[PDB]
Amino acid sequence: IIGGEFTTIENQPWFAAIYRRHRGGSVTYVCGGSLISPCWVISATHCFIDYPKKEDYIVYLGRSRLNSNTQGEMKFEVENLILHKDYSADTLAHHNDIALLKIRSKEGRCAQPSRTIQTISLPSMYNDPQFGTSCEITGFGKENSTDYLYPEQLKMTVVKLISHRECQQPHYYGSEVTTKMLCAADPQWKTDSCQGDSGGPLVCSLQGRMTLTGIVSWGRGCALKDKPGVYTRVSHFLPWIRSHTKE
Ligand SMILES: N=C(N)c1ccc(CNC(=O)[C@H](CO)NC(=O)[C@@H](CO)NS(=O)(=O)Cc2ccccc2)cc1
Numbered sequence: 001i002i003g004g005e006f007t008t009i010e011n012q013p014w015f016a017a018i019y020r021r022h023r024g025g026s027v028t029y030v031c032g033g034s035l036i037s038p039c040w041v042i043s044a045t046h047c048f049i050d051y052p053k054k055e056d057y058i059v060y061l062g063r064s065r066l067n068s069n070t071q072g073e074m075k076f077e078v079e080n081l082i083l084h085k086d087y088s089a090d091t092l093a094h095h096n097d098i099a100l101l102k103i104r105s106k107e108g109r110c111a112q113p114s115r116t117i118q119t120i121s122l123p124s125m126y127n128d129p130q131f132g133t134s135c136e137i138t139g140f141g142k143e144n145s146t147d148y149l150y151p152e153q154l155k156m157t158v159v160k161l162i163s164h165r166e167c168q169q170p171h172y173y174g175s176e177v178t179t180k181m182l183c184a185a186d187p188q189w190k191t192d193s194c195q196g197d198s199g200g201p202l203v204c205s206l207q208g209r210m211t212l213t214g215i216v217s218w219g220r221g222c223a224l225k226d227k228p229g230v231y232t233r234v235s236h237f238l239p240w241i242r243s244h245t246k247e
Contacts, residue, residue, distance in 0.1 A: 002223040003191035004157025009064040012138045014120035016041045017060040032139045032200030039110035043199035045087040045099040054081040062116035072116045076103035093176040097217040097232045120212045123235040131163040135204035141197030145222045157191040159184040182214045185228035193229045194222035202231045
């Protein structure tokens with residue numbers, strides 16, 4: 001997250017931190033995610049596409065820090081890793097960048113709600129906030145494009161939804177952005193999501209309710225003028241979500 005402010009898991013109870021174990025013994029952060037139900041976390045496919053081995057991932061809920069423990073946090077293994085079959089990456093755009101991870105503790109249980117662990121509601125069929133609406137993003141992503149390390153404390157910021165019409169302009173992203181995507185940015189181009197924030201949630205208050213409107217996916221640079229962050233439009237994948245989370 002470029003700019004923005006540091007926060008705690010208490011204020012983002014649905015945020016999931018996903019790590020990958022290495023042959024040696026080191027565990028590195030991979031991507032963010034969101035708990036949409038006790039046993040399911042939603043994230044982005046590009047995060048796991050090169051290493052689709054479910055056994056090498058660890059999911060943390062109720063965690064505020066990157067490399068240290070938080071009281072109340074819960075550790076989970078990945079029972080099932082579901083990547084989208086039509087995922088593909090072009091020059092800039094990442095298509096169908098969404099994924100599902102069925103989690104389970106070592107005892108075989110799913111998440112237990114608490115003050116630091118809660119689910120986030122999914123949107124309704126083709127029911128997104130109006131463009132211009134302010135939404136929040138959260139992540140352990142880079143604070144600056146030139147950094148090679150991630151912040152130790154979780155961060156959050158607020159950006160505004162941009163219409164497809166504006167985002168499809170020549171100086172923006174042209175035809176690379178489709179209707180299955182959502183653009184969002186800071187009108188001043190000072191705050192934005194960045195590398196390491198992938199998979200995280202773009203949350204918007206929709207009719208009084210906190211809704212998982214987008215998933216951090218891609219963008220040209222970070223906090224660059226006329227280069228909004230692009231998010232997977234969750235409201236367009238409800239069918240895919242429901243069909244895979246059944247049985
Ligand atoms: N809002 C943003 N600006 C933004 C930028 C990046 C991401 C994470 N996703 C990726 O990096 C994804 C894949 O991991 N790739 C991209 O996006 C590509 C195009 O396919 N563009 S980029 O090379 O310009 C990203 C970048 C590199 C170095 C420094 C800053 C940014 C998420 C949000």
